[PDB]
Structure 1
Amino acid sequence: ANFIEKITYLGTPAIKAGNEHLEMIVVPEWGSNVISLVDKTTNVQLLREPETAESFHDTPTLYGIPILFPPNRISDGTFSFRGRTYHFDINEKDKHNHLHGFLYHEKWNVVTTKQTDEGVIVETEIDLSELPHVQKQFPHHAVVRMTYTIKENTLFKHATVMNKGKEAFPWGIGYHTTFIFPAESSLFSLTADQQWELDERLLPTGKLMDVPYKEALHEGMDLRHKQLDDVFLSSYQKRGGENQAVIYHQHAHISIIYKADEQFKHWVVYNADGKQGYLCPEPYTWVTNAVNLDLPSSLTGLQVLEPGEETTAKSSITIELN
């Protein structure tokens, strides 16, 4: 049994959808952000929610599930692709980078909803060819469609990226998913053995290094007095196994298993100063500044869409009670 219900979320139109296990709220105008995700059995909110509309607009990448197309930093907002030079807005001033892409602060359209025994589906879409300021930076006819499915104890979250134009383009996508994470009573695990060395502008030097505490990270560790803003390489490419982050809440015994497919090659993990009570385990299909690295695409995760092609990158959030 499942429902869809149109609502107002802090003065903006939104769609609440759910079954008897999970409820989401997606906010199409706010970069199609999944702003709320509630575990129905225990009635716990899983995502960091904004106090007011105003605070959300202040930091739209730090609540719910913001969409990063493309994810993280591009040095000087410049790169070339197949002979051609691109200049993206340098919105991160102190580090002279473009940061977080085109989509987390634009209006997406609701394209359909569907309800059956197989679950409840909400689909949103945005066509970058309709955003003139985006076209000035990135003159290509990219269309991104999100497919959200709640089925049983899992929110599935699929991005389909389409090239509807006449020239090829590089792309990557990531999510700035922000979970409630009380430092005292939560544990975190991640399928990674290595991470990217970063310079003072948070750009990769191109070198990998071992994660010294990787056994701890594998099994589940606390993050008390650890400040993270780290680009981890998923262990999947090299060892197989899983590709996922796990948050465990110790009081309510809730596991949150955030899986991503083989295209999701990197995880940025961010917790600010470690005192803010949240955690962002961010899966990305390409590494920070991927466009500018002369490294194999199997390592960076850089991908290209030829005219007429499309790709679907899949991930999911499963709630288990134990």
Structure 2
Amino acid sequence: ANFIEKITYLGTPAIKAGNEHLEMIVVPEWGSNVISLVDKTTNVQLLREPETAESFHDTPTLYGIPILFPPNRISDGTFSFRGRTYHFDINEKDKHNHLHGFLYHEKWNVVTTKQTDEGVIVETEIDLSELPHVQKQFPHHAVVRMTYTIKENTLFKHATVMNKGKEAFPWGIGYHTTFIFPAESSLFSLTADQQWELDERLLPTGKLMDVPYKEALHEGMDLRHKQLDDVFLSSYQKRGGENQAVIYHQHAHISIIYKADEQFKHWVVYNADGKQGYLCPEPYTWVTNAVNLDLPSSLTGLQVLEPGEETTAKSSITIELN
């Protein structure tokens, strides 16, 4: 049994959808942000929700599931692709970067909803050629379609990126997924062995380094007194196995299994100062500043769509009760 219901989320239109296990709320106007994810059996919210519409706008990448296209930093907002140079708004002024892409602060359209025994689908979409200011920065006919499916106890979360233009473009995608993370009763684990070393501007130098506490990181570890803003290299590339973040709420015995396919080669993990009760295990298909690295694509995970092509990048959130 499953349902869709149109609602108002803090004065914005929104869509609630779900089954007997999980409910989502997606707000198309807020960059198609999946702002709420609720476990119906235990009745607990899993995502960091905003108090007021205003405080959501203050920081639109620190609530629910913000879409980062492309993710994280480009230095000086400048890169070159196939001879051609680009200039993106430098919205991060101290570090002199462009930060977090085009689509998190924009109006997305609902393409369609669909319901079968296979669970409930909501689809959203944005055509970048319909946003004049983005075209100044990035004159390409990129179209992004999100497909959200709740089925059994899982939210499947698929990004289809399409080139409907006449020139090839590099692209990567990331999510700023913000989970409620209580430092004293929450354990965290990630399939990662190495991380990207960063300069003062949170930009990759090019070098990789062993994660000292990698064992603990594999098994599940508390984050008490540990400030993270780290760009990890998914272990799957070298070792196979899983590609996932896991969060474990000790009180209610809830496991949140955040899976992602082979295209997601990096996870940025962010908890601000560690005293804010949240955590952002952010899977990216490409490393920070990927566009500006003279490094193999199988490492940076940089991708290219030629005219007429499309790719789908798959991730899921699984709630397990144990």
Deviations, residues 208-254 of structure 1 (Å, cap 9, x unaligned) = 00000000000000000000000000000000000000000000000
Q: Distance in 2 between matches of 1:192 and 1:320?
A: 22
Q: Distance in 2 between matches of 1:296 and 1:124?
A: 32
Deviations, residues 100-137 of structure 1 (Å, cap 9, x unaligned) = 00000000000000000000000000000000000000
Q: Distance in 2 between matches of 1:168 and 1:3?
A: 39
SS of the equivalent of 1:13 reads strand
Within 5 A, what are the aligned runs for 1:225-236?
225-236=225-236
State the 1:43 CA deviation. Answer: 0.2
State the 1:319 CA deviation. Answer: 0.2
Q: Distance in 2 between matches of 1:95 and 1:197?
A: 16
Deviations, residues 269-314 of structure 1 (Å, cap 9, x unaligned) = 0000000000000000000000000000000000000000000000
Partner of 2:274: 274
SS of the equivalent of 1:144 reads strand
Within 5 A, what are the aligned runs for 1:131-170?
131-170=131-170
Deviations, residues 59-108 of structure 1 (Å, cap 9, x unaligned) = 00000000000000000000000000000000000000000000000000
Q: Distance in 2 between matches of 1:293 and 1:219?
A: 32
Q: Distance in 2 between matches of 1:54 and 1:193?
A: 39
Q: Distance in 2 between matches of 1:81 and 1:71?
A: 17
State the 1:3 CA deviation. Answer: 0.3
SS of the equivalent of 2:30 reads coil
Partner of 2:22: 22
Q: Distance in 2 between matches of 1:64 and 1:298?
A: 29
Deviations, residues 123-172 of structure 1 (Å, cap 9, x unaligned) = 00000000000000000000000000000000000000000000000000
Per the normalisation by structure 1, the TM-score is 1.00
Q: Distance in 1 between matches of 2:320 and 2:99?
A: 34
Deviations, residues 32-57 of structure 1 (Å, cap 9, x unaligned) = 00000000000000000000000000
SS of the equivalent of 1:29 reads helix
Q: Distance in 2 between matches of 1:123 and 1:312?
A: 13
Q: Distance in 1 between matches of 2:119 and 2:18?
A: 9
SS of the equivalent of 2:183 reads coil
Per the normalisation by structure 2, the TM-score is 1.00
Q: Distance in 2 between matches of 1:289 and 1:185?
A: 34
Task: Give me the CA root mean square deviation.
Answer: 0.2
Within 5 A, what are the aligned runs for 1:86-125?
86-125=86-125
**Is residue 2:275 matched to residue 1:290?**
no
Q: Distance in 1 between matches of 2:313 and 2:100?
A: 18
Q: Distance in 1 between matches of 2:235 and 2:59?
A: 31
Q: Distance in 2 between matches of 1:74 and 1:232?
A: 17
State the 1:256 CA deviation. Answer: 0.1
Deviations, residues 162-183 of structure 1 (Å, cap 9, x unaligned) = 0000000000000000000000
State the 1:21 CA deviation. Answer: 0.1
Tell me the percent identity. 100
Q: Distance in 2 between matches of 1:79 and 1:34?
A: 30
Q: Distance in 2 between matches of 1:131 and 1:219?
A: 44
Q: Distance in 2 between matches of 1:209 and 1:171?
A: 26
SS of the equivalent of 2:29 reads coil
Partner of 1:307: 307
Structure 1 unaligned regions, length at least 5:
none
